[PDB]
Amino acid sequence: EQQQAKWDEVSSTLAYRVGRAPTELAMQRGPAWRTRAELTELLYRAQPRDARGSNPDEVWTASLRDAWERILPLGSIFSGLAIKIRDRPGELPATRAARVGRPLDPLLAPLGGGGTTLSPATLGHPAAAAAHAQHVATLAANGVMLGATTNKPPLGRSLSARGRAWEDSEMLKQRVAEYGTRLRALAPHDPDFGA
């Protein structure tokens, strides 16, 4: 808690020094990278066989028996080394199956607990993206021009603020939609980490 108070005061001083919101700061992008890592790992372990890889040796020699291991040789046959690749499809590894979020850091309170969401509707940052879409639709309907003057520099909001981060991509949206059923087979429920 000494370090948490120190981090809060460093974030506040940095935010006032540079001119942006504390959640907008670059120091607080840890959970975004964490949920990005979780989405990538769940996607890789929940891809079909052909999206994972159509290697004729790999698929066949992994599926030769109930055990899934492939021997990758290294070096000559005289002094040879073996890589024992174990990869069971449709299941995350025991040391990798974890969906981690933080319910105690207050900067993720609008997100309701920064965590991994596998539904396409709540994928990424939906509320800020909807607010920005409403704002740009209202500005377009009002007919105002925004880049008219060079004397006014734009305010520096982040991709997570505009809903244009990596997680909010339409291409993850369609990929999760098309792999959604086996994604829910691997991961049963997306938890709401707020409470």
Partner: peptide
């Protein structure tokens, strides 16, 4: 070997 490998890939192509 390779015929038994390649049949295995075709069977699990969607």
């Amino acid at each position: 070997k390779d015929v038994n490998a390649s049949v295995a890939t075709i069977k699990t192509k969607r």
